[PDB]
Design a protein around this ligand. Structure first.
Ligand SMILES: CCCCCCCCCCCCCC(=O)OC[C@H](COP(=O)(O)OCC(O)COP(=O)(O)OC[C@@H](COC(=O)CCCCCCCCCCCCC)OC(=O)CCCCCCCCCCCCC)OC(=O)CCCCCCCCCCCCC
Ligand code: BCL
Ligand SMILES: CC[C@H]1c2cc3[nH]c4c(c3C)C(=O)[C@H](C(=O)OC)c4c3nc(cc4[nH]c(cc(n2)[C@@H]1C)c(C(C)=O)c4C)[C@@H](C)[C@@H]3CCC(=O)OC/C=C(\C)CCC[C@H](C)CCC[C@H](C)CCCC(C)C
Ligand SMILES: *[C@H]1O[C@H](CO)[C@@H](O[C@@H]2O[C@@H](C)[C@H](O)[C@@H](O)[C@H]2O)[C@H](O)[C@@H]1O[C@H]1O[C@H](C(=O)O)[C@@H](O[C@H]2O[C@H](CO)[C@@H](O)[C@H](O)[C@H]2NC(C)=O)[C@H](OC(C)=O)[C@H]1OC(C)=O
Ligand SMILES: CCCCCC/C=C\CCCCCCCC(=O)O[C@H](COC(=O)CCCCCCCCCCCCCCC)COP(=O)(O)OCCN
Ligand SMILES: COC(C)(C)C/C=C/C(C)=C/C=C/C(C=O)=C/C=C/C(C)=C/C=C/C=C(C)/C=C/C=C(\C)CC/C=C(C)/C=C/C=C(\C)C(=O)O
Ligand SMILES: COC(C)(C)C/C=C/C(C)=C/C=C/C(C=O)=C/C=C/C(C)=C/C=C/C=C(C)/C=C/C=C(\C)CC/C=C(C)/C=C/C=C(\C)C(=O)O
Ligand SMILES: COC(C)(C)C/C=C/C(C)=C/C=C/C(C=O)=C/C=C/C(C)=C/C=C/C=C(C)/C=C/C=C(\C)CC/C=C(C)/C=C/C=C(\C)C(=O)O
Ligand SMILES: COC(C)(C)C/C=C/C(C)=C/C=C/C(C=O)=C/C=C/C(C)=C/C=C/C=C(C)/C=C/C=C(\C)CC/C=C(C)/C=C/C=C(\C)C(=O)O
Ligand SMILES: COC(C)(C)C/C=C/C(C)=C/C=C/C(C=O)=C/C=C/C(C)=C/C=C/C=C(C)/C=C/C=C(\C)CC/C=C(C)/C=C/C=C(\C)C(=O)O
Ligand SMILES: COC(C)(C)C/C=C/C(C)=C/C=C/C(C)=C/C=C/C(C)=C/C=C\C=C(C)\C=C\C=C(C)\C=C\C=C(C)\C=C\CC(C)(C)OC
Ligand SMILES: CCCCCCCCCCCCO[C@@H]1O[C@H](CO)[C@@H](O[C@H]2O[C@H](CO)[C@@H](O)[C@H](O)[C@H]2O)[C@H](O)[C@H]1O
Ligand SMILES: [Fe+3]
Lengths: 39, 335, 62, 48, 99, 71, 273, 60, 60, 60, 71, 60, 40, 39, 39, 39
C-alpha cells in the first residue's frame, strides 16, 4: 500500500485543496456578510 | 413424526468461526461464545461484532439521541425515578408548537425534539453506510442495504411530510403510547387513512409478508429432514428437497417458485410494504386532505342508508368552527 | 383544470404499471428450474417465457 | 388570539403530550404523581 | 438433567448415588449400564479405526474420549454394586440381580 | 503519557474523539439556537443590552394553534 | 403439463379420505376428495357472492357489500336479503378453507413432507374462525361478523376499533403488531442474505453458509443458522395471527371498557400505588 | 503530519470528507432557509435594514 | 493498591471510567439546565440575589 | 415415612418447597394490603372497632 | 443442620440469599415510600400523633344529612 | 474472614458491588430531588424552618 | 467439586452467625422505627 | 483462583476502602442532617 | 497481563490523573459557588 | 503495532493539535463573550 513518499505527495494536494476551499468559503462569507450581516 | 422445531443435540467446536472471513480495515470486537439457549432454537454462537468508523459514529450519534429523549421524559415527571418507571409508556418528547412552522422553536417546546430527531436520523444513515460497507467487504450482493433503504424511506417521510405541509408540529412524538396517539390522530386529521390507496397497498404487502414467511418457513421445515434447509446447496445443486418443495406448491395452487426465486418474492413483498407506505404518507396533506372524500370521488366508498337527516337550518346550526388557540387567560365572570 | 384526475390517482397507476412489470419479472425467475414443461403435445413454456437456467461458479479455496 | 400571555409557572404542564389528560390523568389518582404534573412555584430570591 | 428432565423439578432423580435399595434407582442403573457398555464399545472401536488411519491429533482425542467413557461406565458399575448389596439384605427387593 | 497510544490503537481513538467532538459541538449549537438569548440567526444583530434575559419560563409560546397560513 | 422432474413423483397414495377414486391431477393441480369439496364450496360461495352483488346497489368492485344480519336475529339464520346470504357464504368459506387445509395434507403426505404447511395455514383459519364464529357466538349474535366487501369490511374494522375508544392500547394488539412488524423485518433480512450470497457482484464466486452466518452475526450479535431463521419466520408469522385472534376475542366478550383504562392495573402495583 | 495518510487510506477519507461536507452544507442552507431573516428565496431582495430581526428586549 | 490493575485490565477500566464520567457530566448539566434556578443560558447574568428560588412569594 | 427421601431427592424438594412458601406468602400479604379492612400500612393503628367493614345486606 | 451445606453449593446459596434480601428490602421501602403514613422523605419530621392515618369505618349511622360550611 | 475471597472471585464481586452502589446512589438522589422537601437544586438555599413538610393528619 | 463435613461445619458456623447478626441489626432498626412511628 | 496470601492482602484493602467509604458517607449524612433534618 | 512493576507504573499515572481531575473540578465548584450558591 | 518512538512521535502532533484547537476555541469564546456575555 501507501509508501511514505507517496503519502508526502498526497499530503501536498490535500493541504492545498483544504486551504483553497477554505479561501473560497471565506469569500462566500464576505459576500454574504456584505448582503445581510448576522451580527 | 419429528417436527424439527427444537434441537435436542447440539455440538460445540473449541476453536470457532466468529473470527471473520478476510475483511481488511476495522476491528473484530470481542471473542466468540456459545449460548445453550440460543443453541436450542438456532445456532448457538453469540459472538464478535464489526463496527468500523461508520458503526462507531452511528452509536455515538444514536446514544445522544436516546439520552436526549430519556432525559426529557425523566424531566417531564419532575425527575421522579419511581414515576419515570411507573409512567414510562405515557411519557414523550413532543414536537414543537404549530405556530412556529419550520422556524427553530424554544428548547423546552420542541427544541430538544428536533435535536433528538437530527441525531437519530444521522445515526440511521451512518448505520446504513456501516451495513453497505460490510456487505461489500464480505463480498456479498447489496440486497440488504437496499432493503434497509426502503425502511429508511418510510422513516424519512415522517420528516418530509411535515416539511411539505410546513410545520414541525406534525412530526411523530418520541414515546410509546404518545406515538400511537399520533398515529390515530393522523388518520383522524386526514379523514380516515383506510381510504388512502397506498396505505391499503402497504397493508396488502404487510399481510403478504406474513403469508410468504409462514409458507416459506413451513415449507423449508417440512423438507428439512431431506436437507432442504441447506438452501444455498439446493440452489446450486438441486436436490429432492427442492423438487418436493416446488411440486407441493405447484400441486396445491397451480404454480411455484424456485429455491432461489422464493427469496425474491420475499424481498419484494417486504420492501414494498414500506415503499408504498412512504408514498401514501407523502401524498397525505399535500395532495389529498380527506381520504374518505377521495374515496367517494373515485368510487371506493360503499353506500349505507342514512342514519340521520339534517334540515337546512340544522346544516347552518351544526357547522362548528375549526379549532383555534387555547384561552391564555383565566376569566372572572362576576359582572 | 382537471377535476377527476389527481396526483394520488396518477401515482397509483404508476405503481400498478410497475407492480405488473415486477410480477412478470418474478415469474421469469420462477422458471429457471423445471422448465420447459413436459406434456403430451411436446415442450411448453407457459407465459412469460422463463429466464435461462443459471450456472454457479464455486471458489478455488483458501 | 391577537397575542399570547403566559400562564403563571404553576399553571404550566411539564408533560407536553396532548392526550395525557384523558389517557393517563383521568385514571391516575396518585398524590405524588399528581403533584409532579405542574411546575412548582419559582420566585426571585429578593422577593422572598 | 438428561434422564429425569422436567421431573427433576419435582425431585424425581433416579441417577443420584443410592446405597439403600430402591427399585427406581435399580431400574435406572440397569438401563444406564447397558447404554454405557455399548458407549465404551463404540469409543474403543472408534479409537481402533482412527489409529489404523493414523491421524495423530484424532488418535489423541479418541483416547481421551474412551477414557471418559470408561470413567462414566465405572460410576454406573459402582452404583450397580451398591444396589446389589442392598438388594441381598432387603426383603421384597428384586430376585434378578443388578449388575 | 505517550504510552496511552501503545495500549489504545490511535486509529480507533481518533474516530471516537472526532465523533465525540462532533456531537458535543452540534448539541451546544442547537441548544443555543433554540434559546431566546442566543438565537443568533434571528437576533444576532441585537446589542447585548437589548438581548433577552431571564426567559427561562418553560411555556413561553402557545402550545396549540393552527398551522401558519398556508399560501 | 409437468415439470421436467415431476412425473416420477406422481404416485398414488397419501390420501386421507377418497383412496384412489379422486387420486389424480387436473393440469398442475392435485385433486383428491378435498379438491372436489374445495371446488364445490368455492363455486357455491363465489356465485352467492355474485348474487349478493346483483341484489345490491352497484357492481363497482370496491363498493359491493354483503352485510351480516342485524343483532336482533341472535344466533338464528336471518332472511337471505337481510343477512342470511352472508351466513350461507360464511358456511361455504369455512368449508372451502377447511377443505384447502386437508387437501394440503394429502399433498404433503404424497411427497413425504412434514405437515408444517397445513398447520401454519391453520393459524389463518383460526383468525377467520375467531372473527366470524367464536367472537360472534360469545357475543350471542352472528351479526357481529365482518361484512364481505373490499372496503366495507374496513369500515367494520374502524368501528370495532373505536368501540373501545383507543384500540392501540389493547395489549394483545400491541403484541400482534410487534409480530407483524418483526416478521416483515426478518423476511427482508432472510431474503436479502440468500440473494446476496447467490447473486454476488459480477466476477465474484458464489457465497456460502459461512458468509451469511458471519454477516448475520454482526447484524444481530448472534448467528441464527439456516434452520433457525425458518423456525423464526414461521414463529413470527403464525404467532402474529394467533395474537391477532387473541386481541379480537378479548375485545367485547371479555373486556368492554376503553382499552386505555385496562392499564390501570400497572399504575396500581403496590410498589408504587 | 503526512504519516496520518499511513494510518488512514486517503481513498476512504476523501469520500467520508466529501460526504460530511455535503451534509453539513445542506444542513446549514436548510437551517437558514427555514429562518425568518435568511429565507432568501422569498425575501432575498430585501435590503439589510429591511430584513427581519428577532424580538428585542422582551417586557422592556 | 496497584495490584488492582493485575486483577482488572486497565484498557477496559479506562474506557468504562471515561464513559461513566461523560454520561454523569451530561446528566448533571441537563438536570441543571432544566431547572429554573440554574437555567444559566437564559438567566446566567442575573446575579445571586435575584436568581430564582423554589418558594412561593409571601402573602401570595 | 422417611423412606420418601429415597423416592424423592431431598435437595430438589426443599428448593421447590421454599419457592412455594415464598410465593404463597407474598400473594396473601399483597391481597390483604390491597383490601380496605387490612390496609395495615395506612390504617394499622386503628382499633378493631374502627377498622372498615364490607357493606352488609340492607335486610329489607 | 450443617449437612445442608453438603447438599447445596454454598456459593450458589449465598448469592441467592443476598439477591433475595436485596429485592425484599427494596420492595418494602418502596411500598412504604408510596404510602401516606410512611412517606418519610416528605413527612418524616412529623410526630407520631401528627402522622397520617387511613380513615375509619364511618360514623355508625353511615348516612348523610349535613349542615353547610360557614361562609 | 478473608477466605471469603477464595470461595468468591473478587473480580466478580467488585464489579457487582460498584454496579449496585452506583445505581442505588442515583436512585436515592433522584428520589430526594423529586421530593418537595429535598428539591435542593431549586430550594437548597432555604433554611430548615422554611423547607416544605408533607401534610399531617387533619386534626393535627 | 468437593465439600467435606468439616468444611460444611466451618461454613455453618459463619452462615448461622452472620444470619443472626443481620437479624440483630434488623431488630434494632425495628426498635428505632417503632419508637419513631408505630404501625399498630 | 487466589492464593490465601492474595486473599489476606486483598481483604485488608477491601476493608479499608469500605471503612473510608462509610466515613465519607457519615460526614455527608451529618452535613445533610444539619442542613435539613429528615426526622 | 502486566508485570507487577508495570502495573505499579500505570497506577502512578492513574492516581495522578484522577487527583488532577478532582483538583480541576474543585476549582470549577469554587467558581460555581461564588457565582450562585446552591445552599 | 505501534513502537514506542512511533507512539512518542504521534503524541507530539496530538498535543499540538489539541493546543491549537483549544486556542481557536478560546478566541471563539472571547468573541462570543464580548458580543453577548452569559454571566
Ligand atoms: C395488490 C397486491 C396483490 C399481491 C398478490 C400478487 C399475486 C401474484 C401471484 C399470482 C399471479 C401469478 C399466477 C401464475 O403465474 O400462475 C401460473 C400461470 C400458468 O403457469 P405457466 O407455468 O406460465 O403455464 C402453464 C401452462 O404452460 C401449462 O399448464 P397446463 O397445460 O397444465 O394447464 C393450462 C393452464 C392455462 O392457464 C390458465 O388457465 C391461466 C389461469 C389464470 C392465470 C392468472 C390470470 C390472472 C390472475 C387470476 C385472475 C382471476 C382471479 C379471480 O392452466 C393453469 O396453468 C392454471 C394454473 C395457474 C393458476 C393461477 C391462479 C392465480 C390466482 C391469482 C389470484 C390473484 C387475486 C388478486 O401463469 C399465467 O397464466 C400467466 C401469469 C402472468 C403473470 C400474472 C401478472 C400479469 C400482469 C399483467 C401483464 C400483462 C397481461 C399478461
Ligand atoms: C387509527 C390508526 C390508522 C392507521 C394509521 C397509520 C399511519 C399514520 C401510518 C400507518 C402505517 C402503516 N399501517 Mg396503518 N392505520 C390504521 C390501520 C391499520 C391496520 C388495521 C388492521 O386496521 C393495519 C394492518 C395497518 C398497517 C400499516 C402498515 C402497512 C404501515 C406501516 C408499514 C411498516 O412497516 O411500518 C413499520 C416500519 C417503520 C415505521 C419503518 C421504520 C424504519 C426506521 C429506519 C427504524 C429506525 C429504528 C431506530 C434505529 C431505533 C430508534 C430507537 C428509539 C429512538 C428509542 N394499519 C388506521 C386506519 N398507519 C404507515 C404508512 O406507511 O402509512 C401509509 C403510517 O405512517
Ligand atoms: C423492509 C421493511 C422492514 C424493515 C427492514 C429492515 N430494518 C432494518 C434492516 C432491514 C432490512 C436492517 O438491515 C437494519 C438492521 O441493522 O437490522 C438488524 C434495520 C433496522 N431496523 C430497526 C428497527 C425497526 N425496523 C422496523 C421496521 C421495518 N424494518 C420494516 C417492517 C421498526 C418498526 C416496525 O417500528 C423498527 C423499530 C433497527 C433494529 C435496525 C437499524 C439500527 C440502527 O440504525 O441503529 C442506529 C443506532 C442507534 C439508535 C443507537 C443505539 C445506541 C446504543 C444502545 C448505545 C450503546 C453505547 C455505545 C457503545 C456508546 C458509543 C461508544 C463508542 C466509542 C463505541
Ligand atoms: C381571557 O382572555 C383570553 C384571550 O382573549 C380569552 O380567550 C379567548 O376566547 C377563546 C374563544 C379562545 O380560545 C382564545 O383563543 C381567546 O380568543 C379568555 O376567554 C379570557 O377572556 C376574557 O378576557 C378577554 C381578553 O382578551 O382580555 C376579554 O376579551 C375582550 O376584552 C379585551 C380587552 O380586555 C378585548 O381586546 C377583546 O377584543 C374582547 N373580546 C371579546 C370577544 O369581547 C373577554 O371578554 C369577553 C366579553 O369575551 C374576557 O372574557 C370574560 C368572560 O371575561
Ligand atoms: C423501485 C421504483 C418504483 C417506482 C414506482 C413509482 C410509483 C409511484 C410513485 C410515483 C410518483 C408519484 C408522484 C405523486 C405526485 C403527483 O402526481 O403530483 C401531481 C403532479 O403530477 C405528477 O407529479 C405526475 C407524477 C408521475 C409519476 C411518474 C409516472 C411516470 C413513470 C412511471 C414509471 C413506472 C415504471 C417504473 C399533482 O397532483 P394534484 O392532485 O395536486 O393536481 C391537481 C391540483 N389542483
Ligand atoms: C447546529 O449548528 C449548526 C447550525 C449546524 C452550526 C454549526 C456547525 C458546525 C459545528 C460545523 C463544523 C464544521 C467543521 C468542523 O471541523 C468543518 C470542517 C471542514 C473541513 C475540515 C473541510 C475540509 C475540506 C477539504 C477539502 C475540500 C480538500 C480537498 C482536496 C483536494 C481537492 C485534493 C485531493 C487530492 C488530489 C487531487 C491528488 C491525488 C494524488 C494522488 C493520489 C497521487 O499523486 O498519488
Ligand atoms: C410489605 O409487604 C410484603 C413485602 C409483601 C411483606 C413481606 C412478606 C414476606 C413474605 C416476607 C418474608 C421474609 C422472609 C422470609 O423468610 C425473610 C427471611 C430472611 C432471611 C432468612 C435472612 C437471612 C440473612 C442471612 C445473612 C445476611 C447471612 C450472612 C452471612 C454472612 C455475613 C457470613 C459470611 C461468611 C461466609 C459466607 C463464610 C465464608 C467462608 C469462610 C470464612 C471459610 O470457608 O473459612
Ligand atoms: C429511596 O430510598 C430507598 C432506595 C427506597 C431506600 C432503601 C435503600 C436500601 C435498601 C439500601 C441498601 C443499601 C445497601 C445494601 O443493601 C448498602 C450497602 C453498602 C455497602 C456494602 C458498601 C460498601 C462499599 C465498599 C467499598 C466502596 C469498597 C472499596 C474498596 C476499595 C476501593 C479497595 C479495592 C482493593 C484494592 C485497591 C486492592 C487490590 C489488591 C489486589 C488485587 C491484590 O492484592 O492482589
Ligand atoms: C443532581 O444530579 C444527580 C445525578 C441526581 C446527582 C448525583 C450524582 C452522583 C451520585 C454522582 C456520583 C459520582 C461519582 C461516584 O463515585 C464519581 C466518581 C468519579 C471518579 C472516580 C472520577 C475519576 C476520574 C479519573 C480520571 C479522569 C483519570 C485520568 C487519568 C489519566 C489522564 C491518566 C491515565 C493513565 C494513562 C494514560 C496511562 C499512561 C501510561 C501507561 C500506559 C504506561 O506506563 O504503561
Ligand atoms: C448538556 O448541556 C450542555 C450544554 C451540552 C453542557 C454539557 C457539556 C459537557 C458535558 C461538555 C464536555 C466536554 C468535554 C469533556 O471531556 C470536552 C473534551 C474535549 C477534548 C478532549 C478535546 C480534544 C481535542 C483534540 C484535538 C482536536 C486534536 C487534534 C489533533 C490533530 C489534528 C493531530 C492529528 C495527528 C497527526 C497529524 C499526526 C500523524 C502522525 C503519525 C501517524 C505518526 O507520526 O506516526
Ligand atoms: C441517563 O440515561 C437514561 C436513564 C435517561 C437513559 C434512558 C432512556 C430511555 C428510558 C429512553 C426511552 C425512549 C423511548 C421509550 C423512546 C420511544 C420512541 C418511539 C416509540 C418513537 C416512535 C416514533 C418516532 C418517530 C417516527 C420520529 C421521527 C423523527 C424524525 C424523522 C426526525 C427528524 C429530524 C430531523 C432531520 C432534524 C433536523 C434538524 C434541523 C435543524 C434541520 O431541523 C429540522
Ligand atoms: C483530566 C485532567 C488531568 C489533569 C492532570 C494534571 C497534571 C497531573 C500530572 C502531574 C505531573 C507529575 O506527576 C507525576 O508524573 C510522573 C511522571 O512524570 C508519574 O510517575 C510515574 O511514572 C514513572 C515513570 O515514568 C514511575 O517511575 C513513577 O513511579 C510513577 O509514579 C507520577 O505518577 C506523577 O505523580
Ligand atoms: Fe429460505
Amino acid at each position: 500500500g501507501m509508501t511514505e513518499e507517496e503519502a508526502r505527495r498526497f499530503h501536498g494536494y490535500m493541504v492545498t485543496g483544504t486551504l483553497g476551499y477554505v479561501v473560497v468559503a471565506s469569500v462566500a462569507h464576505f459576500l454574504a456578510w456584505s448582503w445581510r450581516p448576522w451580527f | 413424526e419429528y417436527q424439527n422445531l427444537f434441537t435436542r443435540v447440539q455440538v460445540r467446536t473449541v476453536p470457532e468461526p466468529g473470527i471473520p472471513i478476510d475483511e481488511s480495515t476495522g476491528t473484530r470486537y470481542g471473542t466468540g461464545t456459545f449460548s445453550y439457549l440460543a443453541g436450542k432454537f438456532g445456532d448457538a454462537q453469540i459472538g464478535p461484532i464489526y463496527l468500523g468508523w461508520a458503526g462507531v459514529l452511528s452509536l455515538i450519534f444514536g446514544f445522544i439521541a436516546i439520552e436526549i429523549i430519556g432525559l426529557n421524559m425523566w424531566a417531564s415527571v419532575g425527575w421522579d425515578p419511581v414515576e419515570f418507571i411507573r409512567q414510562l409508556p405515557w411519557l414523550a418528547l413532543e414536537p414543537p408548537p404549530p405556530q412556529y412552522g419550520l422556524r427553530v422553536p424554544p428548547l423546552n417546546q420542541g427544541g430538544w425534539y428536533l435535536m433528538a430527531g437530527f441525531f437519530l436520523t444521522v445515526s440511521i444513515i451512518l448505520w446504513w453506510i456501516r451495513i453497505y460497507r460490510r456487505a461489500r467487504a464480505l463480498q456479498m450482493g447489496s440486497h440488504l442495504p437496499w432493503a434497509f433503504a426502503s425502511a429508511i424511506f418510510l422513516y424519512s417521510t415522517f420528516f418530509f411530510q411535515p416539511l411539505l405541509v410546513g410545520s414541525w408540529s406534525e412530526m411523530v412524538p418520541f414515546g410509546i403510547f404518545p406515538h400511537l396517539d399520533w398515529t390515530s390522530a393522523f388518520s383522524i386529521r386526514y379523514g380516515n387513512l383506510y381510504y388512502n390507496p397506498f396505505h391499503a397497498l402497504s397493508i396488502a404487502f404487510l399481510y403478504g409478508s406474513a403469508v410468504l414467511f409462514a409458507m416459506h418457513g413451513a415449507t423449508i421445515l417440512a423438507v428439512a429432514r431431506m436437507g432442504g434447509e441447506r438452501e444455498i446447496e439446493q440452489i446450486t445443486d438441486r436436490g429432492t428437497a427442492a423438487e418436493r418443495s416446488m411440486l407441493f406448491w405447484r400441486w396445491c395452487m397451480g404454480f411455484n417458485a424456485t429455491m432461489e426465486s422464493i427469496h425474491r418474492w420475499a424481498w419484494w413483498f417486504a420492501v414494498l410494504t414500506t415503499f408504498t407506505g412512504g408514498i401514501g404518507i407523502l401524498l397525505t396533506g399535500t395532495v389529498v386532505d380527506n381520504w374518505y372524500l377521495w374515496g367517494v370521488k373515485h368510487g371506493l366508498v360503499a353506500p349505507y342508508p342514512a342514519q340521520n337527516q339534517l334540515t337546512p337550518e340544522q346544516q347552518d346550526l351544526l357547522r362548528g368552527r375549526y379549532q383555534g388557540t387555547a384561552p391564555d387567560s383565566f376569566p372572572s365572570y362576576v359582572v | 383544470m382537471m377535476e377527476y384526475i389527481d396526483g394520488a390517482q396518477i401515482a397509483l397507476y404508476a405503481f400498478w404499471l410497475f407492480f405488473f412489470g415486477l410480477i412478470i419479472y418474478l415469474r421469469r425467475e420462477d422458471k429457471r428450474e423445471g422448465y420447459p414443461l413436459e406434456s403430451p403435445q411436446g415442450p411448453r413454456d407457459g407465459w412469460p417465457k422463463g429466464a435461462p437456467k443459471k450456472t454457479y461458479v464455486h471458489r478455488d479455496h483458501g | 388570539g391577537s397575542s399570547y400571555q403566559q400562564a403563571p409557572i404553576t399553571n404550566q404542564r411539564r408533560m407536553r403530550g396532548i392526550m395525557i389528560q384523558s389517557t393517563l390523568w383521568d385514571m391516575d389518582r396518585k398524590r405524588s404523581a399528581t403533584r409532579q404534573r405542574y411546575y412548582p412555584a419559582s420566585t426571585p430570591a429578593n422577593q422572598l | 438433567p438428561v434422564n429425569d428432565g422436567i421431573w427433576a423439578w419435582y425431585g424425581i432423580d433416579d441417577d443420584r448415588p443410592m446405597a439403600a435399595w430402591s427399585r427406581f434407582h435399580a431400574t435406572r442403573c440397569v438401563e444406564q449400564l447397558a447404554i454405557n457398555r455399548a458407549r465404551v464399545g463404540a469409543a474403543e472401536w472408534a479409537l481402533a479405526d482412527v489409529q489404523a488411519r493414523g491421524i495423530v491429533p484424532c488418535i489423541a482425542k479418541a483416547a481421551a474420549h474412551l477414557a471418559r467413557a470408561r470413567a462414566e461406565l465405572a460410576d454406573w458399575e459402582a452404583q450397580g454394586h451398591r444396589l446389589e448389596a442392598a438388594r441381598k439384605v432387603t426383603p421384597g427387593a428384586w430376585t434378578t440381580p443388578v449388575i | 503519557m505517550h504510552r496511552i497510544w501503545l495500549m489504545y490503537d490511535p486509529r480507533r481513538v481518533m474516530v471516537a474523539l472526532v465523533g465525540f467532538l462532533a456531537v458535543l459541538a452540534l448539541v451546544i449549537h442547537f441548544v443555543l439556537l433554540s434559546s431566546q438569548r442566543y438565537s443568533w440567526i434571528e437576533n444576532g444583530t441585537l446589542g447585548a443590552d437589548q438581548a433577552p434575559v431571564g426567559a427561562s419560563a418553560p411555556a413561553a409560546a402557545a402550545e396549540m394553534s393552527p398551522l401558519p397560513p398556508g399560501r | 403439463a409437468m415439470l421436467s422432474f415431476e412425473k416420477k413423483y406422481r404416485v398414488r397414495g397419501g390420501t386421507l379420505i377418497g383412496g384412489d377414486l379422486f387420486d389424480f391431477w387436473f393440469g398442475p393441480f392435485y385433486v383428491g376428495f378435498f379438491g372436489v369439496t374445495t371446488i364445490f364450496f368455492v363455486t357455491l360461495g363465489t356465485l352467492l357472492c355474485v348474487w349478493g352483488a346483483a341484489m345490491g346497489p352497484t357492481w363497482n368492485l370496491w363498493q359491493i357489500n354483503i352485510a351480516p344480519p342485524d343483532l336482533k336475529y341472535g344466533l338464528g339464520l336471518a332472511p337471505l336479503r337481510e343477512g342470511g346470504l352472508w351466513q350461507i357464504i360464511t358456511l361455504c368459506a369455512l368449508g372451502a378453507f377447511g377443505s384447502w387445509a386437508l387437501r394440503q395434507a394429502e399433498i404433503a403426505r404424497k411427497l413425504g413432507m412434514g405437515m408444517h404447511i397445513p398447520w401454519a395455514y391453520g393459524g389463518a383459519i383460526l383468525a377467520y374462525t375467531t372473527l366470524v364464529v367464536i367472537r360472534p357466538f360469545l357475543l350471542g349474535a352472528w351479526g357481529h361478523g365482518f361484512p364481505y366487501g373490499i372496503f366495507s369490511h374496513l369500515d367494520w374494522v374502524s368501528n370495532v376499533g373505536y368501540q373501545y375508544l383507543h384500540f392501540h392500547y389493547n395489549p394483545a394488539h400491541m403484541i400482534a403488531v410487534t409480530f407483524f412488524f418483526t416478521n416483515c423485518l426478518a423476511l427482508a433480512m432472510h431474503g436479502s442474505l440468500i440473494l446476496s450470497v447467490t447473486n454476488p457482484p459480477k466476477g465474484t464466486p458464489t457465497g456460502t453458509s459461512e458468509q451469511e452466518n458471519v454477516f448475520f452475526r454482526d447484524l444481530l450479535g448472534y448467528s441464527i443458522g439456516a434452520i433457525g431463521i425458518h423456525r423464526l419466520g414461521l414463529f413470527l408469522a403464525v404467532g402474529a395471527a394467533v395474537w391477532s385472534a387473541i386481541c379480537i376475542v378479548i375485545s367485547g366478550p371479555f373486556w368492554t371498557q376503553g382499552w386505555p383504562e385496562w392499564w390501570n392495573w400497572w399504575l396500581n402495583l403496590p410498589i408504587w400505588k
